Scaffold this active site. Structure first.
Site, short mmCIF file in Angstrom:
data_model
loop_
_atom_site.label_atom_id
_atom_site.label_comp_id
_atom_site.label_asym_id
_atom_site.label_seq_id
_atom_site.Cartn_x
_atom_site.Cartn_y
_atom_site.Cartn_z
CB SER A 296 40.83 49.95 39.36
OG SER A 296 39.61 50.66 39.56
CG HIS B 72 36.22 57.51 37.85
ND1 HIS B 72 35.98 58.73 37.26
CD2 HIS B 72 36.11 57.71 39.18
CE1 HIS B 72 35.72 59.63 38.20
NE2 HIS B 72 35.79 59.03 39.37
CG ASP C 147 36.66 51.16 33.02
OD1 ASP C 147 36.19 50.98 34.16
OD2 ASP C 147 37.84 51.49 32.79
C1 LIG Z 1 43.55 50.53 31.80
C2 LIG Z 1 44.47 49.66 30.96
O1 LIG Z 1 45.49 50.10 30.55
N1 LIG Z 1 44.10 48.31 30.66
C3 LIG Z 1 44.99 47.49 29.86
C4 LIG Z 1 46.16 46.94 30.69
C5 LIG Z 1 45.67 46.31 31.98
C6 LIG Z 1 45.25 45.01 32.14
N2 LIG Z 1 44.89 44.87 33.41
C7 LIG Z 1 45.06 46.04 34.08
C8 LIG Z 1 44.83 46.41 35.42
C9 LIG Z 1 45.10 47.70 35.85
C10 LIG Z 1 45.59 48.64 34.95
O2 LIG Z 1 45.85 49.94 35.38
C11 LIG Z 1 45.82 48.29 33.63
C12 LIG Z 1 45.55 46.97 33.21
#
Ligand SMILES: CC(=O)NCCc1c[nH]c2ccc(O)cc12
Ligand SMILES: CC(=O)NCCc1c[nH]c2ccc(O)cc12
Ligand SMILES: *[C@@H]1O[C@H](CO)[C@@H](O)[C@H](O)[C@H]1NC(C)=O
EC number: 3.1.1.98
Length: 345
Positions: free
Chosen positions: A145, A288, A244
């Protein structure tokens, strides 16, 4: 169990200035080291971080960390649970910087919080060198994540750090789980703006080649896997569900034709971004779930599990083109969540 070690350099801190740290289980008969970056979203301004400090404090502070943690999934030492790397030295690095592992800013009279994720990784590596990492042949920097994006942002810096410290023989590689996102159109009406603000709030740092492509003010682009991955030199294996749940959440998806087309297009776009990623595992599931879960062995793409694909990746990186019956590029082509029967229930 993995045992907690708070960083001996107590100036490398979690958000609230408490020391960062790592959990370690050594395996003296192994030259493989797995350093896993925990995930857990992020915070991007004072008010948002204050809220996280009230109800997600373990992600901002070590004051209440337990003395031990059990290694699960790819961090398990049991061969039945971890066919891939059960005998490795295991390191779990708690996420307590709320900066997608990108920050290099201490608390000060101008900063209520410290955002030191990039420095935490380097300090963990530095302190592990005295605990046996100096003898490693492979350092796999893994993460899920926010930790998966953290791998993409930090794997080459770890490789550079070890080279500059005098360890050119340690092969640094990355495993980015569930951190490969699309800056796509949302289903209804953003993360890109929150990341933009976060980077300024954290003094966030991105890999140098990606930074040089996008230039000042545009570093947010490097938080998107498909943009930062081509700039990386270290081998990186990418694990990403095609549907995802974090991606869908920020896309405001929680089924009529418009949503059906939206979801199918998302899977197709994700597939497209992985076409030139030779080491990847991308099942057509809405999930997830992450690689430190105990049943991570269950999912298969084209009849190959992730522990198998990772083993094949290890073989492909031997000093001595594709391996018979041992694939490393595994991306589902079916277009709807759970069209793969092995998806998590
Ligand atoms: C889930 C999301 O918002 N992705 C777009 C922004 C984003 C880029 N890398 C991430 C890593 C963790 C997160 O919580 C969000 C991001
Ligand atoms: C995950 C995410 O942040 N998606 C939004 C990215 C985004 C910001 N502005 C936009 C304008 C048009 C578009 O097609 C996408 C975007
Ligand atoms: C502790 O870490 C900080 C930040 O990386 C660094 O500036 C400092 O030199 C370190 N202290 C020691 C004693 O190594």
């Amino acid at each position: 169990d993995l045992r907690l070690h708070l960083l001996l350099n107590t100036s490398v801190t979690c958000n609230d200035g408490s020391p960062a740290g790592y959990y370690l289980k050594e395996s003296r008969g192994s030259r493989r080291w797995l350093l896993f970056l925990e995930g857990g979203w992020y915070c991007f301004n004072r008010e948002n971080c204050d809220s996280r400090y009230d109800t997600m404090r373990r992600l901002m502070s070590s004051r209440d960390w337990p003395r031990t943690r059990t290694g699960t999934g790819i961090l398990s030492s049991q061969p039945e649970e971890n066919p891939y790397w059960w005998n490795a030295n295991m390191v779990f690095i708690p996420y307590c910087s709320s900066d997608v592992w990108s920050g290099a800013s201490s608390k000060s009279e101008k900063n209520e919080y410290a955002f030191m994720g990039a420095l935490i990784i380097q300090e963990v590596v530095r302190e592990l060198l005295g605990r046996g990492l100096s003898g490693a042949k492979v350092l796999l920097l893994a993460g899920s994540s926010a930790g998966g994006t953290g791998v993409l942002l930090n794997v080459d810096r770890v490789a550079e750090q070890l080279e500059k410290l005098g360890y050119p023989a340690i092969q640094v590689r990355g495993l980015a789980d569930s951190g490969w996102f699309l800056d796509n159109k949302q289903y209804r009406h953003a993360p890109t703006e929150a990341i933009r603000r976060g980077i300024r709030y954290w003094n966030g740092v991105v890999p140098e080649r990606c930074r040089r492509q996008f230039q000042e003010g545009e570093e947010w682009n490097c938080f998107f896997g498909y943009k930062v991955y081509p700039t990386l030199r270290s081998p990186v294996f990418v694990v990403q569900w095609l549907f995802d749940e974090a991606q869908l959440t920020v896309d405001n998806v929680h089924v009529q034709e418009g949503l059906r087309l939206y979801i199918q297009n998302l899977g197709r776009e994700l597939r497209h971004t992985l076409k030139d990623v030779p080491a990847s595992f991308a099942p057509a599931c809405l999930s997830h779930e992450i690689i430190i879960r105990s049943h991570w062995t269950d999912v298969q793409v084209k009849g190959t599990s992730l522990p198998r694909a990772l083993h094949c990746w290890d073989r492909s990186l031997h000093d001595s083109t594709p391996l018979k019956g041992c694939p490393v590029h595994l991306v589902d082509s079916c277009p709807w969540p759970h069209c793969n029967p092995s998806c998590p229930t």
